[PDB]
Design a protein around this motif. Structure first.
Motif, PDB file in Angstrom:
ATOM      1  N   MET A 154       0.839  -1.190   0.000  1.00 55.35           N
ATOM      2  CA  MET A 154       0.000   0.000   0.000  1.00 55.35           C
ATOM      3  C   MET A 154       0.877   1.244   0.000  1.00 55.35           C
ATOM      4  SD  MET A 154      -1.364   0.140   3.927  1.00 55.35           S
ATOM      5  CE  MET A 154      -2.689  -0.962   3.442  1.00 55.35           C
ATOM      6  N   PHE A 155       0.326   2.361  -0.463  1.00 52.55           N
ATOM      7  CA  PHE A 155       1.109   3.585  -0.603  1.00 52.55           C
ATOM      8  C   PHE A 155       1.445   4.253   0.729  1.00 52.55           C
ATOM      9  CE2 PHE A 155      -0.564   3.004  -4.841  1.00 52.55           C
ATOM     10  CZ  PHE A 155       0.493   3.377  -5.647  1.00 52.55           C
ATOM     11  N   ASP A 156       0.505   4.227   1.671  1.00 51.86           N
ATOM     12  CA  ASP A 156       0.709   4.885   2.959  1.00 51.86           C
ATOM     13  C   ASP A 156      -0.297   4.419   4.010  1.00 51.86           C
ATOM     14  OD1 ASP A 156       1.689   6.605   4.913  1.00 51.86           O
ATOM     15  OD2 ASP A 156       1.858   8.300   3.529  1.00 51.86           O
ATOM     16  N   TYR A 157      -0.098   4.867   5.247  1.00 56.67           N
ATOM     17  CA  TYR A 157      -1.046   4.617   6.325  1.00 56.67           C
ATOM     18  C   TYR A 157      -2.332   5.388   6.076  1.00 56.67           C
ATOM     19  CZ  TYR A 157       2.521   2.583   9.439  1.00 56.67           C
ATOM     20  OH  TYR A 157       3.483   1.783  10.010  1.00 56.67           O
ATOM     21  N   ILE A 158      -3.443   4.854   6.570  1.00 59.43           N
ATOM     22  CA  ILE A 158      -4.679   5.618   6.649  1.00 59.43           C
ATOM     23  C   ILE A 158      -5.177   5.603   8.088  1.00 59.43           C
ATOM     24  CG2 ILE A 158      -7.028   5.916   5.832  1.00 59.43           C
ATOM     25  CD1 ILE A 158      -6.365   4.589   3.298  1.00 59.43           C
ATOM     26  N   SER A 159      -5.095   6.753   8.750  1.00 61.02           N
ATOM     27  CA  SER A 159      -5.510   6.858  10.142  1.00 61.02           C
ATOM     28  C   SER A 159      -6.896   7.474  10.260  1.00 61.02           C
ATOM     29  CB  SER A 159      -4.499   7.679  10.940  1.00 61.02           C
ATOM     30  OG  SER A 159      -3.229   7.052  10.932  1.00 61.02           O
ATOM     31  N   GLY A 160      -7.719   6.898  11.130  1.00 60.61           N
ATOM     32  CA  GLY A 160      -9.071   7.377  11.334  1.00 60.61           C
ATOM     33  C   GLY A 160      -9.257   8.030  12.689  1.00 60.61           C
ATOM     34  N   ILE A 161     -10.074   9.077  12.728  1.00 61.31           N
ATOM     35  CA  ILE A 161     -10.347   9.782  13.972  1.00 61.31           C
ATOM     36  C   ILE A 161     -11.720  10.452  13.928  1.00 61.31           C
ATOM     37  CG2 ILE A 161      -9.488  12.109  13.478  1.00 61.31           C
ATOM     38  CD1 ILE A 161      -8.884   9.898  16.615  1.00 61.31           C
ATOM     39  N   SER A 162     -12.299  10.689  15.100  1.00 59.44           N
ATOM     40  CA  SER A 162     -13.574  11.386  15.198  1.00 59.44           C
ATOM     41  C   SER A 162     -13.420  12.634  16.054  1.00 59.44           C
ATOM     42  CB  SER A 162     -14.646  10.472  15.794  1.00 59.44           C
ATOM     43  OG  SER A 162     -14.346  10.144  17.138  1.00 59.44           O
ATOM     44  N   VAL A 163     -14.094  13.709  15.662  1.00 63.43           N
ATOM     45  CA  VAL A 163     -14.052  14.953  16.424  1.00 63.43           C
ATOM     46  C   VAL A 163     -15.451  15.520  16.626  1.00 63.43           C
ATOM     47  CG1 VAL A 163     -13.306  17.352  16.452  1.00 63.43           C
ATOM     48  CG2 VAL A 163     -11.730  15.568  15.706  1.00 63.43           C
ATOM     49  N   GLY A 164     -15.823  15.722  17.885  1.00 64.62           N
ATOM     50  CA  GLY A 164     -17.117  16.287  18.209  1.00 64.62           C
ATOM     51  C   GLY A 164     -17.060  17.798  18.312  1.00 64.62           C
ATOM     52  N   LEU A 165     -18.226  18.430  18.243  1.00 59.89           N
ATOM     53  CA  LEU A 165     -18.320  19.876  18.375  1.00 59.89           C
ATOM     54  C   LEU A 165     -19.411  20.250  19.372  1.00 59.89           C
ATOM     55  CD1 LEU A 165     -17.296  22.641  17.338  1.00 59.89           C
ATOM     56  CD2 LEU A 165     -19.163  22.560  15.676  1.00 59.89           C
ATOM     57  N   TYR A 166     -19.016  20.438  20.627  1.00 59.59           N
ATOM     58  CA  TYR A 166     -19.950  20.852  21.665  1.00 59.59           C
ATOM     59  C   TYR A 166     -20.091  22.370  21.639  1.00 59.59           C
ATOM     60  CZ  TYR A 166     -22.526  20.333  26.052  1.00 59.59           C
ATOM     61  OH  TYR A 166     -23.508  20.316  27.018  1.00 59.59           O
ATOM     62  N   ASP A 167     -21.151  22.840  20.987  1.00 62.64           N
ATOM     63  CA  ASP A 167     -21.382  24.267  20.767  1.00 62.64           C
ATOM     64  C   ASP A 167     -20.214  24.925  20.035  1.00 62.64           C
ATOM     65  OD1 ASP A 167     -22.610  26.779  20.815  1.00 62.64           O
ATOM     66  OD2 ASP A 167     -21.747  27.274  22.772  1.00 62.64           O
ATOM     67  N   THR A 168     -19.186  25.309  20.787  1.00 58.74           N
ATOM     68  CA  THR A 168     -18.017  25.959  20.207  1.00 58.74           C
ATOM     69  C   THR A 168     -16.734  25.205  20.536  1.00 58.74           C
ATOM     70  OG1 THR A 168     -17.698  27.410  22.126  1.00 58.74           O
ATOM     71  CG2 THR A 168     -19.109  28.221  20.343  1.00 58.74           C
ATOM     72  N   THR A 169     -16.824  24.266  21.471  1.00 60.92           N
ATOM     73  CA  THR A 169     -15.657  23.509  21.910  1.00 60.92           C
ATOM     74  C   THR A 169     -15.490  22.204  21.136  1.00 60.92           C
ATOM     75  OG1 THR A 169     -15.696  24.406  24.166  1.00 60.92           O
ATOM     76  CG2 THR A 169     -14.566  22.305  23.829  1.00 60.92           C
ATOM     77  N   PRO A 170     -14.370  22.074  20.407  1.00 56.31           N
ATOM     78  CA  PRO A 170     -14.040  20.832  19.702  1.00 56.31           C
ATOM     79  C   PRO A 170     -13.546  19.772  20.679  1.00 56.31           C
ATOM     80  CG  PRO A 170     -12.909  22.751  18.758  1.00 56.31           C
ATOM     81  CD  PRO A 170     -13.406  23.142  20.107  1.00 56.31           C
ATOM     82  N   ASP A 173     -11.502  12.709  19.647  1.00 54.33           N
ATOM     83  CA  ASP A 173     -11.812  11.323  20.007  1.00 54.33           C
ATOM     84  C   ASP A 173     -13.014  11.220  20.947  1.00 54.33           C
ATOM     85  OD1 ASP A 173     -11.745   8.596  20.158  1.00 54.33           O
ATOM     86  OD2 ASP A 173      -9.679   8.448  20.879  1.00 54.33           O
ATOM     87  N   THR A 174     -14.206  11.144  20.363  1.00 56.42           N
ATOM     88  CA  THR A 174     -15.444  11.131  21.133  1.00 56.42           C
ATOM     89  C   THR A 174     -15.891   9.725  21.516  1.00 56.42           C
ATOM     90  OG1 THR A 174     -16.744  11.148  19.086  1.00 56.42           O
ATOM     91  CG2 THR A 174     -16.278  13.271  20.120  1.00 56.42           C
ATOM     92  N   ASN A 175     -16.432   9.592  22.723  1.00 54.99           N
ATOM     93  CA  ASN A 175     -17.053   8.345  23.150  1.00 54.99           C
ATOM     94  C   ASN A 175     -18.555   8.375  22.881  1.00 54.99           C
ATOM     95  OD1 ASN A 175     -18.101   9.911  25.356  1.00 54.99           O
ATOM     96  ND2 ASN A 175     -16.224   9.482  26.512  1.00 54.99           N
ATOM     97  N   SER A 176     -19.259   7.322  23.283  1.00 50.18           N
ATOM     98  CA  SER A 176     -20.682   7.199  22.982  1.00 50.18           C
ATOM     99  C   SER A 176     -21.525   8.302  23.621  1.00 50.18           C
ATOM    100  CB  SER A 176     -21.208   5.824  23.400  1.00 50.18           C
ATOM    101  OG  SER A 176     -21.035   5.614  24.790  1.00 50.18           O
ATOM    102  N   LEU A 177     -21.172   8.692  24.843  1.00 44.57           N
ATOM    103  CA  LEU A 177     -21.913   9.733  25.551  1.00 44.57           C
ATOM    104  C   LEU A 177     -21.806  11.079  24.847  1.00 44.57           C
ATOM    105  CD1 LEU A 177     -21.309   7.508  27.900  1.00 44.57           C
ATOM    106  CD2 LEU A 177     -21.815   9.427  29.435  1.00 44.57           C
ATOM    107  N   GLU A 178     -20.609  11.395  24.367  1.00 46.35           N
ATOM    108  CA  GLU A 178     -20.363  12.668  23.701  1.00 46.35           C
ATOM    109  C   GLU A 178     -21.019  12.718  22.324  1.00 46.35           C
ATOM    110  OE1 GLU A 178     -16.007  13.317  25.882  1.00 46.35           O
ATOM    111  OE2 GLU A 178     -16.141  12.996  23.715  1.00 46.35           O
ATOM    112  N   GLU A 179     -21.032  11.583  21.630  1.00 46.45           N
ATOM    113  CA  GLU A 179     -21.654  11.507  20.313  1.00 46.45           C
ATOM    114  C   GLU A 179     -23.168  11.670  20.400  1.00 46.45           C
ATOM    115  OE1 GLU A 179     -20.509   7.988  18.258  1.00 46.45           O
ATOM    116  OE2 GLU A 179     -18.421   8.612  17.981  1.00 46.45           O
ATOM    117  N   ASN A 180     -23.744  11.234  21.515  1.00 46.87           N
ATOM    118  CA  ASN A 180     -25.178  11.371  21.736  1.00 46.87           C
ATOM    119  C   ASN A 180     -25.567  12.795  22.114  1.00 46.87           C
ATOM    120  OD1 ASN A 180     -25.704   8.636  21.202  1.00 46.87           O
ATOM    121  ND2 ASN A 180     -25.346   8.058  23.343  1.00 46.87           N
ATOM    122  N   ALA A 181     -24.576  13.603  22.475  1.00 45.53           N
ATOM    123  CA  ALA A 181     -24.833  14.949  22.977  1.00 45.53           C
ATOM    124  C   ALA A 181     -24.362  16.049  22.028  1.00 45.53           C
ATOM    125  CB  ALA A 181     -24.197  15.128  24.349  1.00 45.53           C
TER     126      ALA A 181
END
Ligand SMILES: [Br-]
Ligand SMILES: [Br-]
Ligand SMILES: [Br-]
Ligand SMILES: [Br-]
Ligand SMILES: [Br-]
Ligand SMILES: [Br-]
Ligand SMILES: [Br-]
Ligand SMILES: [Zn+2]
Lengths: 242, 295, 213, 300, 267, 447
Positions: A154-170, A173-181
């Motif tokens: 393969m040509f390179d790594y592919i890294s995955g990540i999730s970012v939540g947005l609580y109003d104005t605060t990024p 790496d979100t967990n289940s509780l944060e994703e629901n909110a």
RNA sequence: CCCCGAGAGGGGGUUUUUUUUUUUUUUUUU
């Protein structure tokens, strides 16, 4: 309206992490040697993922055979006991799952050198044992590790990540509780670059906040790449030294 | 552990001239003079790695040798394979690579051999020679563009296998040599295919003549009607010690096998060789034996 | 609801209501659609059963090649009494093992013998019940195969006693299948004798049906 | 399935044209196709046309009972089954194919999940009887842009549809016909519009992964020929409230993050023009139906 | 079966196994099992979990989840769900093993369902989810060992409210932190192979291919129990067997099972 | 177990059971143990070196004064750490401008208060947020700090672990603030913490109860009236358990609604129920069961013989409910009920005046008096005070603590002195806060 | 192009799911 302190004035989250801290990231290579050519066991937070790479090998049906490239298949098995509340029905044919499988294939078709494995098939089987937010990002990291273990180019790594947005605060790496909110953004970054293989937004996000959220995710994904690369070189040294 | 050995563990899913190690995406060199080989890819002057392995430099050919991967058939290899399918005027045999190898009807010895006249019914009766599931010796005659192997059995040395049992080890533990068929104490013969496929059988007259009406029965499924228990129990023992060497990532050679076979005699019952601690010690005893015998 | 069937309105709810040893009947070859068929009806105490078997084969199998034939058995729920799909699959597997010991598969290369058993009418009149239907299935399949002209090593029959089902061949000398649910402890010898008696009776009636009819 | 054969010459030509700022239909890289919206006689009947692309949507509803979990919410489903009418490339009823499931999921996340339709206002009597709104999309002719065409077809239909007026006497539902009293429109919280971007790599994969300067080409609303030769897809959904409803770049050609952001801002200018366009065509349609109602009463 | 062997290999294996002094290809005795590894309590999200690894790479993962139900309407208090990787949910092997396992662990057959009762109206429903990652033979005994291990390391929530819903009728409330260990006696399922007149415990892949028949024998409370099923390990060499073999198999399990349980009962 | 990470960060497993709607779900979340938790004290010279900025690139402010309220030895200068109970009971005293200036609120306390009483939790957070030069409250995340985090010992109740956690925080703070000569005082009414500190087994921790702490302040006489606290002919019945009423509502046996009590009749109330057309009457003083006007109460239908004309099993109670609905349509007889549980009290800071009838001018010590609330639909409250003569002819603010089944009248405490009756200052101020009108000046965060 | 043969012969170049602190007068400027 959340009665819990998703992001306290002290800059602390429900689990104790700060706004820009990844969860516990522990990789594992060559976990199922007798079951697949390549294998990886991922633990990113409470997320637990088994990934199996079977191939390149002979297709089971000559009808489905490409003479110019290998056939790449991905099947995600989200077990009925992945969440706190056991799901009654299966997710095997769920449209949400078919999209995930399709998404992952479309990601690695442009990374895995399928052209150098004509008339063969690469089957990727995934088992999600436990789920706790950012399951898409963890799926990406599991495939990348397992594919490398299989010695598939393969040509390179592919890294995955999730970012939540609580109003104005990024929140990196979100967990289940944060994703629901809050709304979250899932990224699939190629190597150490700024190029995205996967950009996934399923909930409402202001157009002004999106660019900054991407910036946080890319930076966090680079750290995931480093952890994956670190653990891989460690395993490489322990094997090459015998 | 009188009946079953069960190892347990709680709270965990599982137990938890320098060779340059490189990972995919890593920059290997910036010298455009190099010829990029396998395991690499390039853009102008920069040469990157496509796999996780060690950088290899042979002359002006830069390549990266992967740490893992399936058996890669080289021309002239002695392999052991199983017939996967039969079609037209060829068989496709499972060697253990990315693709099935091919075995053309004209690449085998038909029964009755040189005296036999050519028949157009052979192509319609291939299943009477080699059918699905059959094991055989074969040599990698040629290679296809993608890397697939074309096999041949145009020799008395090669052909259908019988009078024994099959077992396999990772192909990395078996290297190329002058000869892969070996005679061992106990009147048994091993066939160490380079692909990792191993055949252990009772020593035949051919195996003896190698170091010292039948052409009609070269494809018979029938075994030797007279095979003693002492040979059968020898095969089982040779099988277990080979699996033991494989368990310790020890390269299998004809010397390592016989050495392990005699060293395993410590254990009365042959079934004692399947346990982990026994396998690990047997392999460890071989390495240390080569240590104090080599120095 | 379903786009392939007419299941009616969704707000509708099904109607719930408030509060010798064996008598046999055998018939073969009444289904022109297939190669072999059988009708087995049994009446005893507070439970009667009417099941139909149908054998389709030997027919084409377009996959690889096989020196012997491949048997498949599928049980279908009837009109009255229903059973779990799992339970019907389990009996199917148990029946496959039995007739893979009886059917001369060597005579049918690259061929398929598909055996269907329809649990048409199973009435429970008591004002795992599947165990009492098993011997009747084996009887139907044996009749259907013989009616189809499929070679059999021997007339396979069976019996049931206290949740224990065991199928015999060779005049009851050997066993082609053993099934046990619930029941009691150390009652193996008693069950074998009682089932062999049923096996013998069923075999006699089967031969009588295959000959005279 | 049935494949579309694309010669090397056609592949090289269309790609080279892009390298010379040319696309076959004569559009611009950032140019969206002219969207034509035609309403039928009945409410909920809408026909969307983008160049050669033809889609038709039909909104319908019927009295049904809500789920146990949601006693206050009505039912809403969106159907987008493909047929060989749009081209022999599509298998009849193929609802599990890669492109089909994606398209199905994009629309669902744009309309259903986004809450574009007020499902709470679909409830007649809580936990007993409610409306079940259905959006059926019919793909008549395919020349690319099926996602963008569908999202407009569904939204235009929902905003044009009117359900029969209902007066409630306890649990006795009195469904007034259109002859008695006028029908009632649906509740729309926001108007989501999809804009799809197609990506092309003018060079090789090596220069995409490790290349210094980015050179990947991105065009808006690709035709069928451009769609069959692209290396990556991006579908971004926004509304006039300057918010991203959903973004989906499911794999494909790796693309620079800033370029993807540029696309989102470019799409916002398009969805603004499209939304205002839909509203205007709805007003004129209302004025047309009222003018005929006056000419029908005057002649009566 | 799974493994593909030539006619010659099968003939050699059969003769070797059908011999009066039965010779196993790995040198085992007719009662010796192959070494296995078992992990437990690795799924915190679940009430109990196990992972078993065989010597041939066969791997099975079991999860245990609980749910409060009305035992007056919920007849079955223990539901087994089997998922074999690479097989459809409606496959013949899957449903058969599923049906079989549910009978092995019935509420009033091989399981003390009294330990699941909370009040006079409510009880704990146990969901036993099986995931077979890899297997080269009939995984029925493999799954059985994993389910056993999982059920012996399961912890359920503890009740706080009164246990008389007939009169006072209090809503079932549980403690916030304390959990009571599930005391129960999980049954075991042993599988045997019949080659000629010999009976082998824990049949290997190659062994099962040449076997004439097979047996599935359950085990609970120190004695043989139903379900007991004869099973064709393969479909090309299935033959009828003498009754004494059936009695030999039951006797063989009856004396070697406690040894297995003893090695398995270690916490 | 506990895992150590690269950042010096740790991670453990927080697992608890959530009972919801008669259901049982095992909830598991990961719990990270940090090492950079600031003490938030002006005196500290170590914490600012280990502190990190938040999401908006803003380092947290150290607000705890370097020279707090100095008290007679061996207390000297001191910080105050609160227990869960003293917060729930004396939140009014915690808002009093004349006491509690530098207070440390542990995370575990803040969490328990949030679960037990959300409105108090909000008021406590407001004190932390609106910290000025007069009052200073902080939240020390003790559960997230590796130095202070304790885990449940074998055979230990959660209440004792939490008390040990608070005690560990005090122990840590004490040792951490030694070079600055600032002691810590643990204000707790729990007898477990006081006994554990009196024995002085491990470390030295200054433990004082709420009343005992107040008696150490310079203005003890001015704030002693704010401390939360035979007097009957009969006794009110006990309230049903939460588990019982929850099952009652679910089985259609019990019903919740808002109760109305008119000033024309205090012996009769009426609840608005969704299942019933006309409001269910509640006749009697035992049947009202210490309920206030506007309270959300849970009522149980009385037998048909106990109804007004102007059972054992749950089945019979649902039949009684149906007979009640029929009787409401007939308009001949009307169904009655009794409150058995108070869901949400309408209690708040009330304005009233002392009744001259219950105060003895001859008394010099503390005496019980009654206060007449300005709400004519509300009963009177008992007050413990010594300045009964100074609060005689004044508009006062009081807050109700509780109403025991024994006591005939609800119990409360003094809060503020608005001023003399019929004065523009006292009357306007009483007028505003009685109609829930925030008249206080805008906070610093607002400006 | 590759394999095979003392004699330009032959074999191949793969086919729908973690969303619920409930109360007594219009309008305008304050
Ligand atoms: Br290959
Ligand atoms: Br219908
Ligand atoms: Br709802
Ligand atoms: Br075009
Ligand atoms: Br035992
Ligand atoms: Br705040
Ligand atoms: Br009510
Ligand atoms: Zn400090």
């Amino acid at each position: 309206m959340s009665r819990l302190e998703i992001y306290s004035p002290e800059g602390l989250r429900l689990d104790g992490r700060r706004w820009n801290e990844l969860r516990r990231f522990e990789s594992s290579i060559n976990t199922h040697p007798h079951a697949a050519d390549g294998s990886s066991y991922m633990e990113q937070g409470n997320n637990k993922i088994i990934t199996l790479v079977k191939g390149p090998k002979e297709p089971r049906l000559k009808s489905q055979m490409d003479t110019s490239k290998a056939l790449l298949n991905v099947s995600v098995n989200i077990t009925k006991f992945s969440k706190f509340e056991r799901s009654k029905s299966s997710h095997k044919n769920e449209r949400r799952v078919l999209e995930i499988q399709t998404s992952l294939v479309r990601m690695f078709e442009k990374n895995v050198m399928l052209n150098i494995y004509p008339r063969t098939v690469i089957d990727i089987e995934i088992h999600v044992l436990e789920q706790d937010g950012g399951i898409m990002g963890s799926l990406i990291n599991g495939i990348t590790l397992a594919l490398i273990d299989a010695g598939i180019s393969m040509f390179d790594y592919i890294s995955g990540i999730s970012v939540g947005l609580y109003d104005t605060t990024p929140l990196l790496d979100t967990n289940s509780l944060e994703e629901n909110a809050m709304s979250t953004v899932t990224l699939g970054v190629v190597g150490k670059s700024e190029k995205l293989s996967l950009l996934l937004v399923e909930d409402k996000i202001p157009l002004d906040r999106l660019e900054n959220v991407l910036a946080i995710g890319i930076a966090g994904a680079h750290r995931v790449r480093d952890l994956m690369d670190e653990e891989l070189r460690k395993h490489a040294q322990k094997r090459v030294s015998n | 552990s009188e009946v079953i050995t069960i190892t347990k563990r709680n709270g965990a899913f599982q137990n938890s001239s320098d060779s340059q190690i490189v990972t995919p995406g890593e920059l290997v060199t910036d010298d455009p003079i190099w010829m990029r080989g396998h395991g690499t890819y390039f853009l102008d002057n920069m040469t990157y790695s496509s796999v996780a392995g060690t950088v290899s430099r042979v002359n002006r050919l830069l390549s990266v040798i992967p740490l893992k991967g399936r058996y890669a058939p080289e021309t002239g290899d002695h392999v052991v394979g199983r017939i996967a399918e039969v079609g037209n005027k060829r068989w496709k045999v499972d060697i253990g690579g990315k693709q099935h190898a091919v075995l053309m009807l004209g690449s085998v010895n038909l029964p009755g051999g040189i005296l036999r006249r050519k028949s157009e019914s052979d192509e319609l009766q291939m299943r009477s020679f080699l059918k699905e599931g059959d094991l055989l010796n074969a040599e990698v005659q040629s290679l296809f563009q993608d890397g697939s192997a074309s096999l041949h059995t145009r020799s008395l040395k090669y052909g259908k296998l019988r009078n024994g049992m099959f077992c396999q080890v990772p192909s990395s533990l078996i290297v190329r040599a002058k000869n892969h068929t070996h005679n061992l104490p106990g009147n048994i013969t091993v066939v160490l295919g380079v692909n990792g496929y191993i055949w252990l059988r009772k020593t035949s007259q051919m195996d003896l003549a190698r170091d010292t009406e039948s052409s009609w029965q070269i494809y018979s499924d029938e075994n030797d009607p007279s095979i003693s228990n002492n040979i059968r129990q020898a095969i089982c023992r040779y099988a277990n010690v080979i699996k033991a060497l494989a368990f310790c990532e020890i390269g299998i050679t004809q010397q390592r096998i016989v050495s392990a076979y005699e060293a395993s005699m410590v254990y009365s019952n042959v079934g004692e060789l399947i346990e982990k601690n026994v396998m690990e010690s047997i392999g460890s005893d071989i390495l240390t034996a080569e240590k104090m015998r080599g120095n | 609801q379903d786009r392939r069937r007419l299941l009616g309105p969704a707000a509708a709810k099904p109607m719930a209501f408030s509060n010798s040893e064996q008598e046999l009947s055998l018939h073969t070859g009444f289904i022109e659609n297939c190669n072999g068929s059988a009708l087995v009806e049994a009446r005893s105490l507070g439970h009667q059963t009417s099941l139909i078997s149908a054998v389709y084969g030997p027919r084409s199998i377009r996959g690889s090649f096989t020196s012997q034939g491949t048997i498949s058995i599928q049980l279908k729920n009837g009109l009255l009494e229903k059973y779990n799909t799992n339970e019907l699959k389990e009996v199917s597997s148990f029946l496959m093992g039995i007739f893979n010991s009886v059917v001369n598969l060597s005579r049918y290369p690259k061929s398929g013998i598909d055996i269907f058993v329809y649990l048409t009418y199973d009435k429970d009149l008591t004002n795992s019940q599947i165990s009492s239907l098993i011997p009747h299935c084996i009887t139907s399949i044996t009749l259907a195969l013989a009616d189809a002209g499929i070679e059999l090593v021997d007339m396979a029959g069976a019996g049931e006693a206290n949740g224990t089902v065991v199928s015999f061949i060779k005049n009851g000398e050997e066993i082609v299948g053993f099934w046990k649910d619930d029941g009691d402890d150390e009652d193996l010898l008693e069950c074998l004798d009682r089932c062999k008696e049923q096996y013998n009776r069923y075999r006699d009636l089967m031969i009588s049906c295959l000959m005279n009819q | 399935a049935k494949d579309i054969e694309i010669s090397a010459s056609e592949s090289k030509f269309i790609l080279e044209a892009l390298r010379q700022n040319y696309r076959l239909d004569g559009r611009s890289f950032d140019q969206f196709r002219d969207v034509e919206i035609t309403f039928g006689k009945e409410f909920g009947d809408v026909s969307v046309k983008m160049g050669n692309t033809k889609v038709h949507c039909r909104i319908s509803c019927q009295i049904a009972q809500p789920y146990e979990d949601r006693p206050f919410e009505g039912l809403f489903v969106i159907s987008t089954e493909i047929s060989p009418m749009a081209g022999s490339q599509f298998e009849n009823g193929n609802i599990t194919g890669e492109d089909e499931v994606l398209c199905s999921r994009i629309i669902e996340k744009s309309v259903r999940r986004s809450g574009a339709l007020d499902v709470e206002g679909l409830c007649i009597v809580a936990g007993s009887k409610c409306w079940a709104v259905r959006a059926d999309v019919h793909f008549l002719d395919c020349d690319g842009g099926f996602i963008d065409a569908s999202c407009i077809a569904v939204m235009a239909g929902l905003m044009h549809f009117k359900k029969p007026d209902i007066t409630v006497h306890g649990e006795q539902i009195i469904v007034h016909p259109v002859n008695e009293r006028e029908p009632v429109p649906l509740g729309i919280l926001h108007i989501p519009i999809c804009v799809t971007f197609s990506f092309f790599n003018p060079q090789d994969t090596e220069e995409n992964i490790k290349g210094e300067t980015n050179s990947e080409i991105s065009i808006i609303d690709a035709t069928l020929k451009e769609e069959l030769l692209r290396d990556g897809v991006l579908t971004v959904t926004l509304n006039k409230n300057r918010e991203v409803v959903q973004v989906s770049k499911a794999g494909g050609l790796p693309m620079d993050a800033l370029t993807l952001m540029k696309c989102c801002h470019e799409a916002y200018s398009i969805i603004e023009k499209i939304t205002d366009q839909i509203l205007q065509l709805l007003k004129e349609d209302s004025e047309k139906r009222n003018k005929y109602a006056a000419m029908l009463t005057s002649e009566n | 079966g799974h493994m593909s062997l030539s006619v010659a290999e099968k003939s050699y294996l059969y003769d070797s196994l059908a011999s009066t002094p039965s010779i196993r290809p790995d040198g085992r005795l007719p009662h010796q099992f192959r070494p296995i590894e078992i992990f437990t309590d690795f799924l915190p999200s679940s009430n109990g979990s196990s992972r078993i690894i065989a010597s041939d790479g066969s791997e099975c993962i079991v999860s245990i989840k609980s749910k409060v139900v009305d035992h007056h309407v919920e007849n079955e208090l223990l539901q087994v769900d089997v998922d074999i990787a690479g097989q459809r949910d409606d496959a013949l092997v899957v449903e058969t093993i599923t049906s079989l396992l549910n009978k092995v662990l019935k509420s009033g057959s091989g399981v003390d369902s009294s330990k699941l009762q909370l009040t006079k109206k409510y009880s704990f429903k146990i969901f036993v989810d099986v995931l077979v990652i890899s297997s080269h033979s009939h995984p029925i005994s493999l799954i059985s060992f994993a389910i056993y291990s999982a059920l012996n390391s399961t912890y359920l929530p503890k009740l706080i409210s009164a246990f008389d819903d007939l009169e006072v009728e209090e809503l079932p409330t549980f403690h916030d932190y304390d959990m009571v260990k599930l005391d129960i006696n999980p049954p075991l399922v042993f599988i045997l192979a019949v080659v000629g007149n010999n009976m082998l415990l824990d049949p290997a892949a190659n062994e099962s291919e040449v076997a004439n028949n097979g047996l599935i024998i359950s085990w609970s409370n120190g004695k043989i129990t139903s379900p007991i099923r004869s099973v064709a390990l393969n479909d090309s060499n299935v033959k009828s067997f003498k009754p004494h073999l059936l009695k030999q198999g039951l006797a063989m399990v009856e004396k070697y099972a406690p040894d297995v349980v003893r090695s398995l009962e270690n916490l | 177990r506990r895992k150590r990470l690269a950042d010096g960060l740790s991670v453990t497993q927080k697992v608890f059971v959530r009972s919801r709607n008669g259901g049982a779900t095992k909830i598991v979340r990961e719990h990270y143990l940090r090492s950079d938790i600031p003490c938030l004290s002006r005196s500290c010279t170590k914490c600012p070196q280990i502190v990190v900025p938040d999401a908006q690139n803003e380092l947290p402010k150290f607000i705890l004064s370097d020279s707090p309220l100095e008290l007679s030895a061996p207390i000297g200068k001191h910080y105050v750490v609160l227990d869960t109970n003293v917060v729930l009971q004396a939140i009014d005293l915690l808002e009093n401008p004349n006491c509690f200036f530098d207070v440390i609120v542990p995370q575990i306390v803040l969490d328990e208060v949030r679960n037990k009483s959300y409105p108090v939790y909000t008021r406590l957070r407001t004190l932390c947020r609106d910290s000025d030069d007069h009052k200073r409250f902080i939240v020390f995340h003790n559960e997230f700090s590796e130095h202070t985090f304790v885990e449940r010992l074998p055979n230990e109740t959660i209440n004792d672990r939490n008390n040990r956690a608070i005690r560990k925080t005090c122990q840590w703070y004490s040792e951490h603030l030694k070079p600055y000569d600032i002691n810590v005082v643990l204000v707790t009414n729990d007898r477990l913490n006081r006994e554990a500190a009196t024995k002085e087994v491990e470390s030295n921790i200054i433990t004082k109860s709420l009343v005992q702490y107040i008696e150490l302040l310079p203005n003890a006489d001015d704030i002693r009236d704010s401390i939360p606290q035979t007097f009957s002919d009969f006794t009110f019945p006990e309230y049903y358990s939460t588990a019982r009423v929850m099952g009652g509502l679910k089985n259609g046996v019990l019903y919740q609604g808002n109760i109305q009590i008119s000033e024309y009749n205090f012996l009769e109330g009426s609840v608005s129920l969704p299942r019933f057309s006309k409001p269910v009457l509640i006749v009697g003083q035992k049947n009202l069961n210490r309920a206030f006007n506007g309270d959300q109460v849970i009522v149980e239908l009385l037998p048909q013989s106990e109804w007004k004309a102007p059972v054992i099993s749950d089945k019979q109670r649902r039949l009684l409910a149906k007979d009640a609905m029929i009787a409401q349509r007939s308009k001949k007889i009307q169904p009655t009920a009794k409150v058995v549980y108070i869901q949400r009290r309408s209690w708040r800071q009330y304005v009233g005046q002392l009744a001259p009838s219950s105060v003895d001018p001859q008394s010099s010590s503390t005496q019980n008096v009654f206060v007449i609330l300005m709400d004519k639909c509300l009963p009177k409250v008992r007050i413990r005070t010594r300045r009964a003569a100074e609060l005689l002819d004044k508009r006062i603010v009081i807050s109700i603590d509780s109403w025991p089944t024994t006591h005939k009248y609800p119990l409360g405490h003094f809060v503020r002195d608005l001023g003399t009756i019929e004065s523009a200052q006292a009357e306007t101020e009483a007028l505003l806060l009685e109609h829930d009108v925030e008249y206080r000046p805008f906070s610093k965060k607002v400006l």
